[PDB]
């Protein structure tokens, strides 16, 4: 899983907003710098900037 290093506020409807420390499952990472992520904390799914998150445990 991944963890957010920064908060992120969605800039389009299909982005995923998240908070620093939130645990994310990366569900698609082959389309570019923006990855499709599923929040394990909120259950929501949307695109995220890959440089705002890092591998977790």
């Amino acid at each position: 899983t991944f963890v957010a290093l920064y908060d992120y506020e969605s800039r389009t409807e299909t982005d995923l907003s998240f908070k620093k420390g939130e645990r994310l499952q990366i569900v698609n990472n082959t389309e570019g710098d923006w990855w499709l992520a599923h929040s394990l904390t909120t259950g929501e799914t949307g695109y995220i900037p890959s440089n705002y998150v890092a591998p977790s445990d």
């Binding site: 920064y6 389309e31 710098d33 900037p49 440089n51």
Partner: peptide
């Protein structure tokens, strides 16, 4: 915070 990356290539 880091610069946001450009949006992905849209698929057709």
């Amino acid at each position: 915070a880091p610069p946001l990356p450009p949006r992905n290539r849209p698929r057709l």
